[PDB]
Amino acid sequence: DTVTIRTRKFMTNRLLQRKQMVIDVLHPGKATVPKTEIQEKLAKMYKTTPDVIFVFGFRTHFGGGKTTGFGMIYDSLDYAKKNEPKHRLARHGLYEKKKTSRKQRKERKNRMKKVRGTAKANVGAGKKPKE
Amino acid sequence: WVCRKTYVTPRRPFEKSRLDQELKLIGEYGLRNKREVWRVKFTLAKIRKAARELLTLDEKDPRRLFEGNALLRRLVRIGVLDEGKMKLDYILGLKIEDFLERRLQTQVFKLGLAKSIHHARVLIRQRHIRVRKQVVNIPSFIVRLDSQKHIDFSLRSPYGGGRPGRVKRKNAKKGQGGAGAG
Amino acid sequence: FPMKQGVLTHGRVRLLLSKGHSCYRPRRTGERKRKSVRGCIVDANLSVLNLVIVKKGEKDIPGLTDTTVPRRLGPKRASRIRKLFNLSKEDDVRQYVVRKPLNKEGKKPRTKAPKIQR
Amino acid sequence: MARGPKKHLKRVAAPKHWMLDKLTSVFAPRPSTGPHKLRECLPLIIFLRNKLKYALTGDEVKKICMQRFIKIDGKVRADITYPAGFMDVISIDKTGENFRLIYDTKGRFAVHRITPEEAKYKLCKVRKIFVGTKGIPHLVTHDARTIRYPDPLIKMNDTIQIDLETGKITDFIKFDTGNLCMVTGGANLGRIGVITNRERHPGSFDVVHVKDANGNSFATRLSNIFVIGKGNKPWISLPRGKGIRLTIAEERDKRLAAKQSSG
Amino acid sequence: ATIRVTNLSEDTRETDLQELFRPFGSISRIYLAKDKTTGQSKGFAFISFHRREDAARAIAGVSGFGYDHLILNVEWA
Amino acid sequence: MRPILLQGHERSITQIKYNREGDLLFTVAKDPIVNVWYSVNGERLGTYMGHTGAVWCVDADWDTKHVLTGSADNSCRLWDCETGKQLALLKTNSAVRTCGFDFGGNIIMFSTDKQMGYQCFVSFFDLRDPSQIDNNEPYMKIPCNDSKITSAVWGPLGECIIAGHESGELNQYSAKSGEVLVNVKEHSRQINDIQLSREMTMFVTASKDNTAKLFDSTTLEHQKTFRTEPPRELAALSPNYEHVVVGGGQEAMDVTTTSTRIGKFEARFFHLAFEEEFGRVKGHFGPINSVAFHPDGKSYSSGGEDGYVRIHYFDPQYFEFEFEAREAG
Amino acid sequence: KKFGNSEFDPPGPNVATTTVSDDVSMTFITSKEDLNCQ
RNA sequence: UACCUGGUUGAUCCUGCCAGUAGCAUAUGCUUGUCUCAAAGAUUAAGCCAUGCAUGUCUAAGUACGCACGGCCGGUACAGUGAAACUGCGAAUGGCUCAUUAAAUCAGUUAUGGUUCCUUUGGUCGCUCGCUCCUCUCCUACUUGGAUAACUGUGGUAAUUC
RNA sequence: CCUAUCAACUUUCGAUGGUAGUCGCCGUGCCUACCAUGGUGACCACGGGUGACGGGGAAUCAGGGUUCGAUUCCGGAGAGGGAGCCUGAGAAACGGCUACCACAUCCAAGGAAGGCAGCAGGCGCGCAAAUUACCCACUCCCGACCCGGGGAGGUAGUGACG
Predict the structure, then answer these.
(1) Is the CB of residue E43 less than 8 Å from the CB of residue E8?
(2) Chain A: which residues have CB within 8 Å of chain F?
(3) Separation of CA A53 and C1' H16 in angstroms?
(4) Chain B residues touching D249 at Cβ < 8 A
(5) Which of D101, D117, D133 corresponds to the end of one domain?
(6) CATH at D64
(7) Is residue D156 within 8 Å of D174, Cβ to Cβ?
(8) Residues in CB range of F242: below 8 A, 6 or more apart
(9) DSSP class of residue D16?
(10) D250 located within any domain
(11) How crowded is residue A105: how many other Cβ atoms within 10 Å of its Cβ?
């Protein structure tokens, strides 16, 4: 309600093909309308659709009535996918990282050391203990 | 990283006359305890030592000039010191009171919605004012000159205007549950 | 205890073994392991003697001479193929190459020859 | 122990003038091996994402570099922590902007856009001028570029316009009294000025009396003086903060006056 | 090492020995043979020191030292 | 079937016995605690702590109010089942080598070895309950024949003793004063176990000469022979179907640093009337030392040298399937 | 535990829960062994 | 914040130490609501150690004959992708702890004209200057020689990253 | 830094120097021949002691001073103790090796494999000090590399040091 997105520190970034900016959202008394709302709202300003817009940061300001965050708008989805930090993709789901996770890989790596050749053998050796 | 105390403990623990003096300051300026008084004692002693050092430096010396002016400017910004005086000699003459008087609590007394040096502190701590459009919850604060021109009710205390919390609504339901009988 | 060349005697000794020697397998560069190795001259305490027939006689033994296990890997060097047909290296190897089909590798069969170097 | 050289450098142990933070990050970028020494260098990353702010992760920095849109000294780099130094030109080919690094007299590396005309060449002072093997002469510049068959009248502390299109010497400027210099390092960091007199002392360490534009006079060691061209004839412009020398009082007056007066 | 102690009383337990053998270095553990069918502390104990120096020092001193009006006997286990 | 693993013993199992109300499993090991487990839901009922040494054998009465234990500490104890407290101790001058309830449950046999203070014989203790305390005490000793007995069990109607011998003899005793009625020589190594059928006319034998035999009680002929490649440490007849379940012995074991992934010791099911294997059920990590059957045959339990007890829950599918050749005839 | 399994925890699934599956599949016919071995 | 005050006696003035007193750094006692910052197995055993894990690595691009997977696309060597293995590099760095050592370590200031240095960055990349051209005959240049892995098969060992 | 209840010390297994050579990445008594008889001390040497790592730094003091520094950073040193070595530009390396010594482990008795002063954890010790957790997204490091791996490091938990 009664937001307005005011863009400090605007950057035309031609070499990562994106408009990079701070998002300053005034509110009447309660800090922060949704991240999804902000991407939609911003989307019709620069006319790029919200699906090439990512928004991150965000931290409510005491006594309400403001929230400063950060946004990026990619000219195309290809550009977004190519600068691409995993956490940014994660933030509103559409890709998340590995879920193997971690100690499975370490066990596997220790199995490979034992013998020379025979890939499949070491997989099966890692797989029998669950313990 | 690094941390430091903001108060100082004197070398005599019982010194009756001084204890009375400190209690009087607490009464006058609405403070929590002796630690509040000690907090100002620590700051004031450092200011006087700063001043005294500068004053024994040679005149027309970059270090004395630059840091002198800075010390003066800071003390005038917070309205402790006046710039019709404005040198080292006068800074020495300042005392504990002069700081306390420029606090947020004592301004909230002098204008606005406090009735006492009691009331004021509780009002600040319960977020009844904004200094500008910015809530301040700390009564020991020290406001600057042009920050005393913007002390006013908050929009998160719902008298003086603001969204209903649950304390206004509590009073409403002493008329609709106290006197509504349900 | 594995046998190797040059240990000699009928005894068993532990020798410090380095790369390019039998009875040791590398596990880090500059690493050498002192391992037991069994004399090159046979006693009788062997679990298995590895014997190789070099000349056959005239009379078959079932699982070795009757039965036959081939191998599919041909030469990947140019000139061993060239030598075997006496065909000039001014005209390279030329189609004679040992290509083996691997059937149903995808949903179709392949025919693969190694990618010759030299 | 200590069985060999470190491949890491911690932050809060890196040189001040790179303008990194205190303890909020536990590792500094660290320069790669290259033509300049690591103290005086400015890793590519600090320029790219801390001054020009094109990345907010390290993941992005690697991805930027692999585009190969960045040439440094006319040649195509892809190193994440390139050891750029004094009068090294960075060429962004995607935007047509050439930036060179030259000290403020504050002591902070300047973001100093230059025209692509001035990014054709850079002036490099000779460090040694070497009679090489089989009687072929070479000059060697500070930035470790060896150019064979150099002009046959040159002598030590001359500057040399190196060209970055084609390499090699593209004339030279002779070392003489009153030449422009920028005094680099020490307590005289980023000051510009003439010479006046170079005092010579036999044996190690010879000091060069410099007079700056303001008329403040000082000496420094010859090592700390870098010759940047011919007297009263710049070939690149002065950077921000004067680049000469300014007092802490004057500097405060500028800081307060310009702020809340722009926008 | 491990040292054996003998001529313990039934009024001498692990706790009474624990403070006794601290001037000869810190004990790692004190095992004490108990049988509750007959008596309490049988008469033999096995004190285990962590370090070889500390163990030997004990054997030397404690043998001839009185504790609860008896001459304790200590010797290598 | 689905087997699950019950852990609560840290030492090799020595004897498993079901009660006759089919809802408790008693298991004992070389631990100074016995464990009692539900065999209908797998929850632990409790433990019996108070033993000073290894308890070799446990057995539960018909009522399910008393358990009796045989000890190598030279005692027989009566424990009150429903409080977990020992209610009577009798000191014995010899260890208990075998214990077995009679089918009327008011007498129990304890086998007292040739060595120690008591001589070779199967002593019979009357279980007489005056008041709330069941009292055990002997009033007969049946003297052994031949070489020393190793095992003993009750033959038909509990009026005979069938005994297994160190020599490898199976002897029949007319149990009221002894002695030999008939005997057969049919094993050349120690008979480890002999338990009786539920039709009370045949019994099953186990021996470390790797034979298990289905044996006629009253004639002492081998009816059927079950030959296993590993030795057999115990054998039981499994009701609910006409199989026998045998379990043992030594097979390859090569690491002592892993004991949770060397599962390769099985209990074998043989069909009683055809001598044909109907299953091998792996899961044990060391030799099976004891096999015990549920009195309704809806579970069987095997105890391992690994030191754990697996309780096995049959499904309807198991009871209804059988090898084709046996069905045909 | 000092002794038994009736202290400190009570008997039950306080002392009969495992962190590794001990439940395995067997056939109901005769190929119980073959299923494990493969 | 440049301070002292209490105790020798009948009383008094001195010499004097003792005790009080504040800082602080650990320990410990007792108590403890909300907000932020974080030092933390040094002392004493640089004692001893179960288990888990802390260094690995592929670009269109050194080297694919996977039991691979997928193709129509097949011969000159032919595949797109690719477990593996060889090759090259890291593994000396990192992290940890302060036992050891008294001009030793180390700090600051100097040196290597006394020496070694992968890599990166910049130069240096046809030739025997024709053996007074074997290199026009030394005529393999449209390119030489032959063996190991992974692989396939047989295996040994109570137990080994054998 | 402390010590004279340490006043003479250094070479017969070089102590100092000359000369020449062996040797070493390279200087050099580094080592060796021959030849000299030096070198050092009351300005504390020599010897002994040391919870003696060094610095940047820390705490308190009117000023003067006094006390602290294993401990977020820099240098050096060691990875159970000793000795030797391989690889590599760089290691006398314990998540390399080899021997012995002190410790510990498996064993079928023939053998075989090992080093938490790494991160967690346990035992011992004590007045004294935390999760057997989650993650490579950040910060950087390594590699053939944007792509992978990281108890580097981040993150939470424990936390009235403060």
Answers:
(1) yes
(2) 128-129, 131
(3) 85
(4) 62, 65-66
(5) D117
(6) 3.10.290.10
(7) no
(8) F271, F272, F273
(9) G
(10) no
(11) 12
